């Protein structure tokens, strides 16, 4: 997948409706069902201090960037077989681009 | 002369490829109309629909059950125990219109099978052949279980569906799916966080969360945890009863085991009351969309 800048506002709505259930994005924000995502880009998978990751997530050892994040969100279980994140994926490129444009900003 | 028998009769020329086409239609719509219930999607309500339409069965006189597809009639449609199921019914309407030849009971049950499989649950062998019966065959309300009860109530209730301890505990694991809605049942909240993925989370949460019995906004009591999950009084009775607890524990520690038992119990549930000719086809095991490179 190759990221292309989109709409942060629409991404914020996608996050609220599809992600907030399990993740927070603010710096120092709390872990919930899923790991807090602040600082996610530029960090390796399964490294959020204080969160109990699945064995599969940590072993993926992916250094998250806008592109592999797009690949991941297209089909999570496919990219990280065995992850415990329950989410079928955002199948539309436009959707993934708006979301990551927002995530890049909200986490930053 | 004497008691009701319901013989499985699959429409002429209709075979496995036909039913797989219906399965695909449901699975596709499940993906397309994904906003429902804050994006949980229609999978859980479809599973609850298959269960409520089959759960009216009384093994003592063979009334109710999935055979006749009577939920389409007023009386059952408006059973308060079915509040919210109208959503699953509406979801399936267009599907039935595209495939007019499928029976109502066959469609309601296939809907539950498809939803379980598409939510990554176990494969549920399924058999076609349910036949629509007249309005007069619609059971009265009152046959579905009350959630504010205890283990003894759960055990004796399920005896009417010919279900044993193992089958009861396994079937209850479907509560991993969806959530309770205060406007529908007087209870509010999800049993877990993976609302639209079929796992053994129900048993894990039952055993690992710290539960506190509390009143909700409808004045009913439910067991709530700090994580924001809930358990109905009947769900929690599974760890109050010793026999049930041992089975809860084994599913909590072995999902493959839960999957296999749930598969057997759910098909049995779906086929209760049905007499299948001995020359009838082997149950069908539909391929998921993923399994079709789709
Ligand atoms: C639960 C129902 C969740 C929803 C909805 C989403 N996520 Fe998730 N996410 C969740 C869990 C429990 C986990 C852990 C996975 C594991 O196997 O341990 C995650 C993980 C991620 C990750 C990786 C984080 C890291 O490696 O540090 C990302 C980047 C992530 N989730 C993103 C994310 C987004 C953008 C979501 C919606 C579109 C989303 N998650 C939904 C649980 C849940
Ligand atoms: C194999 C299926 C299955 C069994 C058996 C089952 N349920 Fe559930 N039940 C569901 C599903 C799935 C939902 C979630 C529905 C949704 O999210 O719309 C549900 C939802 C409910 C709800 C909430 C409905 C609402 O929308 O408010 C109640 C209350 C309930 N079940 C009670 C029971 C009781 C009592 C028993 C038996 C002791 C039982 N269930 C057995 C599948 C089942």
CSV table of C-alpha atoms and ligand atoms in Angstrom, one decimal:
chain,number,residue,atom,x,y,z
A,1,UNK,CA,0.0,0.0,0.0
A,2,UNK,CA,1.1,3.5,-0.7
A,3,UNK,CA,-0.3,6.3,1.4
A,4,UNK,CA,-1.5,9.6,-0.1
A,5,UNK,CA,-2.5,12.6,2.0
A,6,UNK,CA,-6.3,12.9,2.6
A,7,UNK,CA,-8.8,14.7,4.8
A,8,UNK,CA,-8.0,14.8,8.6
A,9,UNK,CA,-11.6,15.8,9.4
A,10,UNK,CA,-13.0,12.7,7.7
A,11,UNK,CA,-10.3,10.6,9.2
A,12,UNK,CA,-11.2,11.9,12.7
A,13,UNK,CA,-14.8,10.7,12.0
A,14,UNK,CA,-13.5,7.3,10.9
A,15,UNK,CA,-11.4,7.0,14.0
A,16,UNK,CA,-14.3,8.0,16.3
A,17,UNK,CA,-16.7,5.6,14.7
A,18,UNK,CA,-14.3,2.7,14.0
A,19,UNK,CA,-11.4,3.0,16.4
A,20,UNK,CA,-12.1,5.0,19.6
A,21,UNK,CA,-14.0,2.0,20.9
A,22,UNK,CA,-10.7,0.5,21.6
A,23,UNK,CA,-7.9,3.1,21.3
A,24,UNK,CA,-7.0,6.6,22.5
A,25,UNK,CA,-4.6,8.8,20.6
A,26,UNK,CA,-3.5,11.6,23.0
A,27,UNK,CA,0.0,11.6,24.4
A,28,UNK,CA,0.1,9.7,27.7
A,29,UNK,CA,-3.5,8.6,26.9
A,30,UNK,CA,-4.6,5.3,28.6
A,31,UNK,CA,-4.5,1.8,27.1
A,32,UNK,CA,-8.0,0.3,26.8
A,33,UNK,CA,-9.1,-2.8,24.9
A,34,UNK,CA,-6.2,-1.8,22.6
A,35,UNK,CA,-3.0,0.1,23.1
A,36,UNK,CA,-2.9,3.9,23.2
A,37,UNK,CA,-1.6,5.0,19.7
A,38,UNK,CA,0.3,8.1,20.5
A,39,UNK,CA,3.7,8.0,18.8
A,40,UNK,CA,2.7,4.9,16.8
A,41,UNK,CA,4.4,6.0,13.6
A,42,UNK,CA,8.1,5.4,13.8
A,43,UNK,CA,7.8,2.8,16.5
A,44,UNK,CA,7.9,-1.0,16.1
A,45,UNK,CA,4.7,-3.0,16.6
A,46,UNK,CA,4.1,-4.3,20.1
A,47,UNK,CA,6.3,-1.7,21.8
A,48,UNK,CA,3.7,0.5,23.5
A,49,UNK,CA,5.0,0.4,27.1
A,50,UNK,CA,2.5,-1.0,29.6
A,51,UNK,CA,0.3,-2.9,27.1
A,52,UNK,CA,-0.1,-6.7,26.9
A,53,UNK,CA,0.3,-7.4,23.2
A,54,UNK,CA,-0.4,-10.6,21.4
A,55,UNK,CA,2.6,-12.7,20.6
A,56,UNK,CA,1.9,-12.3,16.9
A,57,UNK,CA,1.8,-8.5,17.0
A,58,UNK,CA,5.2,-8.1,18.7
A,59,UNK,CA,6.8,-10.7,16.3
A,60,UNK,CA,5.6,-8.8,13.3
A,61,UNK,CA,8.2,-6.3,14.4
A,62,UNK,CA,7.0,-3.8,11.8
A,63,UNK,CA,8.4,-0.3,12.1
A,64,UNK,CA,5.1,1.5,11.5
A,65,UNK,CA,4.8,4.1,8.7
A,66,UNK,CA,2.0,5.5,6.7
A,67,UNK,CA,2.3,2.8,4.1
A,68,UNK,CA,2.4,-0.4,6.1
A,69,UNK,CA,-0.2,1.1,8.3
A,70,UNK,CA,-2.4,1.3,5.2
A,71,UNK,CA,-1.6,-2.3,4.4
A,72,UNK,CA,-2.4,-3.3,8.0
A,73,UNK,CA,-5.8,-1.5,8.2
A,74,UNK,CA,-6.9,-3.1,4.9
A,75,UNK,CA,-7.0,-6.5,6.6
A,76,UNK,CA,-5.5,-6.7,10.1
A,77,UNK,CA,-5.6,-10.5,10.6
A,78,UNK,CA,-4.1,-10.9,7.2
A,79,UNK,CA,-1.1,-8.7,7.9
A,80,UNK,CA,-0.6,-9.9,11.5
A,81,UNK,CA,-2.2,-13.5,11.6
A,82,UNK,CA,-3.4,-14.1,15.1
A,83,UNK,CA,-3.6,-10.5,16.3
A,84,UNK,CA,-6.4,-10.1,18.8
A,85,UNK,CA,-7.6,-6.8,17.4
A,86,UNK,CA,-11.1,-7.5,16.2
A,87,UNK,CA,-11.6,-5.4,13.1
A,88,UNK,CA,-12.3,-6.5,9.5
A,89,UNK,CA,-10.6,-3.6,8.0
A,90,UNK,CA,-11.2,-0.4,6.0
A,91,UNK,CA,-11.4,-1.7,2.4
A,92,UNK,CA,-11.5,1.7,0.7
A,93,UNK,CA,-8.2,3.4,-0.1
A,94,UNK,CA,-9.8,6.8,0.4
A,95,UNK,CA,-10.9,5.7,3.8
A,96,UNK,CA,-7.5,4.4,4.8
A,97,UNK,CA,-5.9,7.6,3.5
A,98,UNK,CA,-8.3,9.9,5.4
A,99,UNK,CA,-7.8,7.9,8.6
A,100,UNK,CA,-4.0,7.8,8.4
A,101,UNK,CA,-3.9,11.5,7.6
A,102,UNK,CA,-5.8,12.0,10.9
A,103,UNK,CA,-3.7,9.5,12.9
A,104,UNK,CA,-0.5,11.1,11.7
A,105,UNK,CA,-1.7,14.3,13.2
A,106,UNK,CA,-3.5,13.1,16.3
A,107,UNK,CA,-0.6,11.0,17.4
A,108,UNK,CA,2.4,12.9,16.0
B,1,UNK,CA,-54.9,-39.3,14.5
B,2,UNK,CA,-51.7,-38.2,16.4
B,3,UNK,CA,-48.8,-35.8,17.0
B,4,UNK,CA,-46.9,-33.6,14.6
B,5,UNK,CA,-44.0,-34.6,12.4
B,6,UNK,CA,-42.1,-32.2,10.1
B,7,UNK,CA,-40.4,-33.8,7.2
B,8,UNK,CA,-37.5,-32.1,5.5
B,9,UNK,CA,-38.3,-31.3,1.9
B,10,UNK,CA,-35.8,-29.4,-0.2
B,11,UNK,CA,-37.3,-27.7,-3.3
B,12,UNK,CA,-36.9,-29.4,-6.6
B,13,UNK,CA,-33.6,-28.9,-8.4
B,14,UNK,CA,-32.2,-26.7,-5.6
B,15,UNK,CA,-28.8,-27.9,-4.4
B,16,UNK,CA,-25.6,-26.9,-2.6
B,17,UNK,CA,-24.5,-24.3,-5.2
B,18,UNK,CA,-27.9,-22.6,-4.8
B,19,UNK,CA,-27.6,-22.3,-1.1
B,20,UNK,CA,-24.0,-21.2,-1.3
B,21,UNK,CA,-25.3,-18.4,-3.5
B,22,UNK,CA,-27.7,-17.3,-0.7
B,23,UNK,CA,-25.0,-17.6,1.9
B,24,UNK,CA,-22.8,-15.3,-0.3
B,25,UNK,CA,-25.7,-12.8,-0.7
B,26,UNK,CA,-26.0,-12.6,3.1
B,27,UNK,CA,-22.3,-12.4,3.7
B,28,UNK,CA,-22.0,-9.7,1.1
B,29,UNK,CA,-24.8,-7.6,2.5
B,30,UNK,CA,-23.2,-8.1,5.9
B,31,UNK,CA,-20.1,-6.3,4.6
B,32,UNK,CA,-22.0,-3.6,2.6
B,33,UNK,CA,-24.4,-2.5,5.3
B,34,UNK,CA,-21.8,-2.3,8.0
B,35,UNK,CA,-22.9,0.8,9.9
B,36,UNK,CA,-25.7,-0.9,11.8
B,37,UNK,CA,-25.6,-0.7,15.6
B,38,UNK,CA,-22.5,1.6,15.7
B,39,UNK,CA,-20.6,-0.6,13.2
B,40,UNK,CA,-21.1,-3.9,15.1
B,41,UNK,CA,-22.9,-4.9,11.8
B,42,UNK,CA,-25.9,-7.2,11.5
B,43,UNK,CA,-24.0,-10.4,12.3
B,44,UNK,CA,-25.0,-10.7,16.0
B,45,UNK,CA,-28.7,-9.9,15.5
B,46,UNK,CA,-28.8,-12.5,12.7
B,47,UNK,CA,-27.4,-15.1,15.1
B,48,UNK,CA,-30.0,-14.1,17.7
B,49,UNK,CA,-32.7,-14.3,15.1
B,50,UNK,CA,-31.7,-17.9,14.1
B,51,UNK,CA,-31.7,-18.8,17.8
B,52,UNK,CA,-35.0,-17.1,18.7
B,53,UNK,CA,-36.8,-18.6,15.8
B,54,UNK,CA,-35.5,-22.1,16.7
B,55,UNK,CA,-35.7,-21.7,20.4
B,56,UNK,CA,-39.5,-21.7,20.4
B,57,UNK,CA,-39.3,-25.5,20.1
B,58,UNK,CA,-40.9,-27.7,22.7
B,59,UNK,CA,-39.6,-31.3,22.5
B,60,UNK,CA,-42.6,-32.7,24.2
B,61,UNK,CA,-45.2,-32.0,21.5
B,62,UNK,CA,-42.9,-30.8,18.6
B,63,UNK,CA,-44.5,-27.4,18.4
B,64,UNK,CA,-42.4,-24.3,17.5
B,65,UNK,CA,-38.9,-24.7,16.2
B,66,UNK,CA,-37.3,-23.4,12.9
B,67,UNK,CA,-39.3,-25.7,10.6
B,68,UNK,CA,-42.4,-23.6,9.9
B,69,UNK,CA,-40.7,-20.1,9.8
B,70,UNK,CA,-43.6,-18.7,11.7
B,71,UNK,CA,-41.7,-15.6,13.0
B,72,UNK,CA,-43.1,-14.0,9.8
B,73,UNK,CA,-46.5,-13.9,11.4
B,74,UNK,CA,-47.7,-11.1,13.7
B,75,UNK,CA,-47.9,-12.9,17.0
B,76,UNK,CA,-44.4,-14.1,17.1
B,77,UNK,CA,-43.0,-11.1,15.3
B,78,UNK,CA,-44.3,-9.0,18.2
B,79,UNK,CA,-43.3,-11.4,21.0
B,80,UNK,CA,-41.7,-8.9,23.4
B,81,UNK,CA,-38.9,-11.5,23.8
B,82,UNK,CA,-38.1,-10.7,20.2
B,83,UNK,CA,-37.7,-6.9,20.6
B,84,UNK,CA,-35.1,-5.7,18.1
B,85,UNK,CA,-35.2,-8.8,15.9
B,86,UNK,CA,-37.2,-6.8,13.4
B,87,UNK,CA,-33.8,-5.5,12.3
B,88,UNK,CA,-32.6,-9.0,11.3
B,89,UNK,CA,-35.9,-9.6,9.6
B,90,UNK,CA,-35.5,-6.4,7.5
B,91,UNK,CA,-31.9,-7.3,6.7
B,92,UNK,CA,-33.1,-10.6,5.2
B,93,UNK,CA,-36.1,-9.3,3.2
B,94,UNK,CA,-34.2,-8.2,0.1
B,95,UNK,CA,-32.3,-11.5,0.3
B,96,UNK,CA,-35.5,-13.5,0.2
B,97,UNK,CA,-36.8,-11.3,-2.7
B,98,UNK,CA,-33.6,-12.2,-4.7
B,99,UNK,CA,-34.1,-15.9,-3.8
B,100,UNK,CA,-37.9,-16.4,-3.6
B,101,UNK,CA,-37.6,-20.2,-3.7
B,102,UNK,CA,-35.9,-20.5,-0.3
B,103,UNK,CA,-38.2,-21.3,2.7
B,104,UNK,CA,-38.5,-18.7,5.5
B,105,UNK,CA,-37.1,-21.1,8.1
B,106,UNK,CA,-34.4,-22.1,5.8
B,107,UNK,CA,-33.5,-18.4,5.4
B,108,UNK,CA,-33.6,-17.5,9.1
B,109,UNK,CA,-31.4,-20.4,10.0
B,110,UNK,CA,-29.0,-20.0,7.1
B,111,UNK,CA,-28.7,-16.3,8.2
B,112,UNK,CA,-27.4,-17.4,11.6
B,113,UNK,CA,-24.9,-19.9,10.1
B,114,UNK,CA,-23.6,-17.3,7.7
B,115,UNK,CA,-23.2,-14.7,10.4
B,116,UNK,CA,-21.3,-17.1,12.6
B,117,UNK,CA,-18.9,-18.2,9.8
B,118,UNK,CA,-18.3,-14.7,8.5
B,119,UNK,CA,-17.4,-13.5,11.9
B,120,UNK,CA,-14.6,-16.1,11.9
B,121,UNK,CA,-16.4,-18.6,14.0
B,122,UNK,CA,-16.6,-22.4,13.5
B,123,UNK,CA,-18.1,-24.0,10.3
B,124,UNK,CA,-21.7,-24.9,11.0
B,125,UNK,CA,-22.9,-27.8,8.9
B,126,UNK,CA,-26.4,-26.9,7.6
B,127,UNK,CA,-29.3,-28.8,6.1
B,128,UNK,CA,-31.9,-27.4,3.8
B,129,UNK,CA,-35.5,-28.5,3.7
B,130,UNK,CA,-37.6,-26.5,6.2
B,131,UNK,CA,-41.1,-25.8,4.9
B,132,UNK,CA,-43.3,-22.8,5.6
B,133,UNK,CA,-46.4,-23.7,7.7
B,134,UNK,CA,-49.7,-21.6,8.1
B,135,UNK,CA,-50.2,-18.8,10.6
B,136,UNK,CA,-52.2,-21.2,12.9
B,137,UNK,CA,-49.0,-23.0,13.6
B,138,UNK,CA,-47.4,-20.0,15.2
B,139,UNK,CA,-46.6,-20.7,18.8
B,140,UNK,CA,-47.7,-18.2,21.5
B,141,UNK,CA,-45.2,-15.9,23.1
B,142,UNK,CA,-43.6,-17.1,26.4
B,143,UNK,CA,-41.3,-19.8,25.1
B,144,UNK,CA,-38.0,-17.9,25.1
B,145,UNK,CA,-35.8,-17.7,28.3
B,146,UNK,CA,-36.0,-14.9,31.0
B,147,UNK,CA,-32.5,-13.5,31.6
B,148,UNK,CA,-33.1,-12.5,35.2
B,149,UNK,CA,-33.0,-16.1,36.4
B,150,UNK,CA,-30.5,-18.6,37.8
B,151,UNK,CA,-28.6,-21.8,36.8
B,152,UNK,CA,-31.4,-24.2,37.8
B,153,UNK,CA,-33.7,-22.2,35.6
B,154,UNK,CA,-31.3,-22.3,32.7
B,155,UNK,CA,-30.8,-26.0,33.0
B,156,UNK,CA,-34.5,-26.8,33.2
B,157,UNK,CA,-35.3,-24.4,30.4
B,158,UNK,CA,-32.8,-25.9,28.0
B,159,UNK,CA,-34.0,-29.4,28.8
B,160,UNK,CA,-37.1,-28.4,26.7
B,161,UNK,CA,-34.7,-28.0,23.7
B,162,UNK,CA,-33.1,-31.4,24.4
B,163,UNK,CA,-29.8,-29.6,25.4
B,164,UNK,CA,-27.4,-30.9,28.1
B,165,UNK,CA,-24.9,-29.0,30.2
B,166,UNK,CA,-22.2,-29.1,27.6
B,167,UNK,CA,-24.5,-27.9,24.8
B,168,UNK,CA,-26.0,-25.2,27.0
B,169,UNK,CA,-22.6,-23.7,28.0
B,170,UNK,CA,-21.3,-23.9,24.4
B,171,UNK,CA,-24.4,-22.2,22.9
B,172,UNK,CA,-24.2,-19.4,25.5
B,173,UNK,CA,-20.8,-18.6,24.2
B,174,UNK,CA,-22.6,-16.8,21.3
B,175,UNK,CA,-22.9,-13.9,23.8
B,176,UNK,CA,-19.4,-13.0,22.7
B,177,UNK,CA,-21.4,-11.4,19.8
B,178,UNK,CA,-23.1,-8.1,19.9
B,179,UNK,CA,-24.6,-6.5,23.0
B,180,UNK,CA,-27.7,-6.0,25.1
B,181,UNK,CA,-29.6,-2.8,24.3
B,182,UNK,CA,-31.7,-1.1,27.0
B,183,UNK,CA,-34.5,-0.3,24.6
B,184,UNK,CA,-34.9,-3.9,23.6
B,185,UNK,CA,-34.4,-6.1,26.7
B,186,UNK,CA,-34.1,-3.8,29.7
B,187,UNK,CA,-30.4,-4.7,29.8
B,188,UNK,CA,-27.5,-2.6,28.6
B,189,UNK,CA,-23.9,-3.3,27.5
B,190,UNK,CA,-21.6,-5.7,25.6
B,191,UNK,CA,-20.3,-8.9,27.1
B,192,UNK,CA,-16.9,-8.1,25.7
B,193,UNK,CA,-14.9,-5.9,23.4
B,194,UNK,CA,-14.7,-8.1,20.2
B,195,UNK,CA,-18.4,-7.6,19.4
B,196,UNK,CA,-18.3,-8.9,15.8
B,197,UNK,CA,-15.6,-11.7,16.0
B,198,UNK,CA,-16.6,-15.1,17.2
B,199,UNK,CA,-14.2,-16.1,20.0
B,200,UNK,CA,-14.2,-17.6,23.5
B,201,UNK,CA,-14.1,-14.1,25.0
B,202,UNK,CA,-17.4,-14.7,26.9
B,203,UNK,CA,-15.9,-17.4,29.1
B,204,UNK,CA,-12.6,-15.5,29.5
B,205,UNK,CA,-14.5,-12.4,30.6
B,206,UNK,CA,-16.8,-14.4,32.9
B,207,UNK,CA,-13.7,-15.8,34.7
B,208,UNK,CA,-11.2,-12.9,34.6
B,209,UNK,CA,-13.2,-9.7,35.1
B,210,UNK,CA,-14.3,-8.4,38.5
B,211,UNK,CA,-18.0,-8.4,38.4
B,212,UNK,CA,-20.3,-6.2,40.5
B,213,UNK,CA,-24.1,-6.8,40.7
B,214,UNK,CA,-25.8,-3.4,39.9
B,215,UNK,CA,-29.1,-1.9,38.8
B,216,UNK,CA,-29.3,-0.4,35.4
B,217,UNK,CA,-31.4,2.4,34.0
B,218,UNK,CA,-34.4,0.1,33.4
B,219,UNK,CA,-34.2,-1.0,37.1
B,220,UNK,CA,-33.1,-4.5,36.3
B,221,UNK,CA,-30.0,-5.9,37.9
B,222,UNK,CA,-27.0,-7.1,35.8
B,223,UNK,CA,-23.4,-7.9,36.6
B,224,UNK,CA,-21.0,-5.1,35.4
B,225,UNK,CA,-17.2,-5.0,35.3
B,226,UNK,CA,-14.8,-2.1,35.4
B,227,UNK,CA,-13.9,-2.7,31.7
B,228,UNK,CA,-17.4,-1.7,30.8
B,229,UNK,CA,-18.7,-5.2,30.1
B,230,UNK,CA,-21.8,-6.9,31.4
B,231,UNK,CA,-23.3,-10.3,32.1
B,232,UNK,CA,-27.0,-11.1,32.4
B,233,UNK,CA,-28.1,-12.9,35.6
B,234,UNK,CA,-28.4,-16.1,33.5
B,235,UNK,CA,-24.9,-15.7,32.0
B,236,UNK,CA,-23.3,-15.3,35.4
B,237,UNK,CA,-25.2,-18.3,36.7
B,238,UNK,CA,-22.7,-20.4,34.6
B,239,UNK,CA,-20.0,-19.6,37.2
B,240,UNK,CA,-22.4,-19.9,40.1
B,241,UNK,CA,-23.2,-23.5,39.3
B,242,UNK,CA,-20.3,-26.0,39.7
B,243,UNK,CA,-21.1,-28.2,36.8
B,244,UNK,CA,-21.4,-25.2,34.5
B,245,UNK,CA,-18.2,-23.6,35.9
B,246,UNK,CA,-16.0,-26.5,34.9
B,247,UNK,CA,-17.2,-26.3,31.3
B,248,UNK,CA,-16.8,-22.5,31.3
B,249,UNK,CA,-13.2,-23.0,32.4
B,250,UNK,CA,-12.4,-25.5,29.8
B,251,UNK,CA,-13.7,-23.3,26.9
B,252,UNK,CA,-11.9,-20.3,28.4
B,253,UNK,CA,-8.7,-22.3,28.1
B,254,UNK,CA,-9.4,-24.0,24.7
B,255,UNK,CA,-11.2,-22.1,21.9
B,256,UNK,CA,-10.9,-25.0,19.4
B,257,UNK,CA,-12.8,-27.1,21.8
B,258,UNK,CA,-15.5,-24.4,22.3
B,259,UNK,CA,-15.8,-24.1,18.5
B,260,UNK,CA,-16.4,-27.8,17.9
B,261,UNK,CA,-19.0,-28.1,20.6
B,262,UNK,CA,-20.7,-24.9,19.7
B,263,UNK,CA,-20.9,-26.0,16.0
B,264,UNK,CA,-22.6,-29.3,17.0
B,265,UNK,CA,-25.0,-27.7,19.4
B,266,UNK,CA,-26.0,-24.8,17.1
B,267,UNK,CA,-26.7,-27.1,14.2
B,268,UNK,CA,-28.8,-29.3,16.6
B,269,UNK,CA,-30.6,-26.2,17.8
B,270,UNK,CA,-31.3,-25.3,14.1
B,271,UNK,CA,-32.5,-28.8,13.3
B,272,UNK,CA,-34.6,-29.6,16.4
B,273,UNK,CA,-38.1,-30.8,15.5
B,274,UNK,CA,-37.1,-31.8,11.9
B,275,UNK,CA,-37.4,-35.3,10.6
B,276,UNK,CA,-34.8,-35.7,7.8
B,277,UNK,CA,-35.4,-38.6,5.3
B,278,UNK,CA,-32.6,-41.2,5.5
B,279,UNK,CA,-31.9,-40.6,1.8
B,280,UNK,CA,-31.5,-36.9,2.5
B,281,UNK,CA,-28.2,-35.2,1.5
B,282,UNK,CA,-25.2,-34.8,3.9
B,283,UNK,CA,-25.2,-31.4,5.7
B,284,UNK,CA,-23.7,-28.6,3.6
B,285,UNK,CA,-20.6,-26.8,4.9
B,286,UNK,CA,-20.4,-23.4,3.1
B,287,UNK,CA,-17.2,-21.8,2.1
B,288,UNK,CA,-16.6,-18.4,3.7
B,289,UNK,CA,-16.0,-15.4,1.5
B,290,UNK,CA,-12.4,-15.4,2.6
B,291,UNK,CA,-12.2,-19.0,1.4
B,292,UNK,CA,-13.3,-17.8,-2.0
B,293,UNK,CA,-10.5,-15.3,-2.3
B,294,UNK,CA,-13.3,-12.8,-1.8
C,1,LIG,C1,-11.3,-3.6,19.2
C,1,LIG,C2,-12.6,-4.0,19.1
C,1,LIG,C3,-10.5,-2.7,18.4
C,1,LIG,C4,-10.9,-1.9,17.4
C,1,LIG,C5,-12.3,-1.4,17.0
C,1,LIG,C6,-9.6,-1.5,16.7
C,1,LIG,N1,-8.5,-2.0,17.4
C,1,LIG,FE1,-6.6,-1.6,16.9
C,1,LIG,N2,-6.0,-2.9,18.3
C,1,LIG,C7,-6.9,-3.5,19.2
C,1,LIG,C8,-6.1,-4.5,20.0
C,1,LIG,C9,-6.6,-5.3,21.1
C,1,LIG,C10,-4.8,-4.4,19.6
C,1,LIG,C11,-3.7,-5.4,20.0
C,1,LIG,C12,-3.3,-6.4,18.9
C,1,LIG,C13,-2.6,-7.6,19.3
C,1,LIG,O1,-2.6,-8.6,18.7
C,1,LIG,O2,-1.9,-7.4,20.4
C,1,LIG,C14,-4.8,-3.4,18.5
C,1,LIG,C15,-3.6,-3.0,17.8
C,1,LIG,C16,-3.6,-2.0,16.9
C,1,LIG,C17,-2.4,-1.5,16.2
C,1,LIG,C18,-0.9,-1.9,16.6
C,1,LIG,C19,-0.4,-1.1,17.7
C,1,LIG,C20,1.0,-1.4,18.1
C,1,LIG,O3,1.6,-2.4,17.5
C,1,LIG,O4,1.6,-0.7,19.0
C,1,LIG,C21,-2.8,-0.5,15.5
C,1,LIG,C22,-1.8,0.4,14.8
C,1,LIG,C23,-4.2,-0.3,15.6
C,1,LIG,N3,-4.7,-1.3,16.4
C,1,LIG,C24,-5.0,0.7,15.0
C,1,LIG,C25,-6.4,0.8,15.1
C,1,LIG,C26,-7.2,1.6,14.2
C,1,LIG,C27,-6.6,2.8,13.4
C,1,LIG,C28,-8.4,1.1,14.3
C,1,LIG,C29,-9.6,1.4,13.6
C,1,LIG,C30,-9.7,1.7,12.2
C,1,LIG,C31,-8.4,0.1,15.3
C,1,LIG,N4,-7.2,-0.1,15.7
C,1,LIG,C32,-9.6,-0.6,15.7
C,1,LIG,C33,-8.2,-3.4,19.3
C,1,LIG,C34,-9.0,-2.7,18.4
C,2,LIG,C1,-26.7,-19.4,20.1
C,2,LIG,C2,-27.4,-18.2,20.3
C,2,LIG,C3,-27.8,-17.7,21.6
C,2,LIG,C4,-28.2,-18.3,22.7
C,2,LIG,C5,-28.4,-19.8,22.9
C,2,LIG,C6,-28.7,-17.2,23.6
C,2,LIG,N1,-28.5,-16.0,23.1
C,2,LIG,FE1,-28.8,-14.2,23.9
C,2,LIG,N2,-28.2,-13.3,22.2
C,2,LIG,C7,-27.6,-13.9,21.2
C,2,LIG,C8,-26.9,-12.8,20.3
C,2,LIG,C9,-25.9,-13.1,19.2
C,2,LIG,C10,-27.3,-11.7,20.9
C,2,LIG,C11,-26.8,-10.2,20.5
C,2,LIG,C12,-27.9,-9.6,19.6
C,2,LIG,C13,-27.5,-8.2,19.1
C,2,LIG,O1,-26.4,-7.7,19.4
C,2,LIG,O2,-28.4,-7.6,18.4
C,2,LIG,C14,-28.1,-12.0,22.0
C,2,LIG,C15,-28.7,-11.0,22.8
C,2,LIG,C16,-29.5,-11.3,24.0
C,2,LIG,C17,-30.1,-10.3,24.8
C,2,LIG,C18,-30.0,-8.8,24.5
C,2,LIG,C19,-31.0,-8.4,23.4
C,2,LIG,C20,-31.1,-6.9,23.2
C,2,LIG,O3,-30.9,-6.5,22.0
C,2,LIG,O4,-31.3,-6.1,24.1
C,2,LIG,C21,-30.7,-10.9,25.8
C,2,LIG,C22,-31.5,-10.3,27.1
C,2,LIG,C23,-30.4,-12.3,25.7
C,2,LIG,N3,-29.6,-12.5,24.5
C,2,LIG,C24,-30.8,-13.3,26.6
C,2,LIG,C25,-30.5,-14.6,26.4
C,2,LIG,C26,-30.9,-15.7,27.4
C,2,LIG,C27,-31.7,-15.5,28.7
C,2,LIG,C28,-30.4,-16.9,27.0
C,2,LIG,C29,-30.5,-18.2,27.5
C,2,LIG,C30,-30.3,-18.4,29.0
C,2,LIG,C31,-29.8,-16.6,25.6
C,2,LIG,N4,-29.8,-15.2,25.4
C,2,LIG,C32,-29.3,-17.5,24.8
C,2,LIG,C33,-27.5,-15.2,20.9
C,2,LIG,C34,-27.9,-16.2,21.8
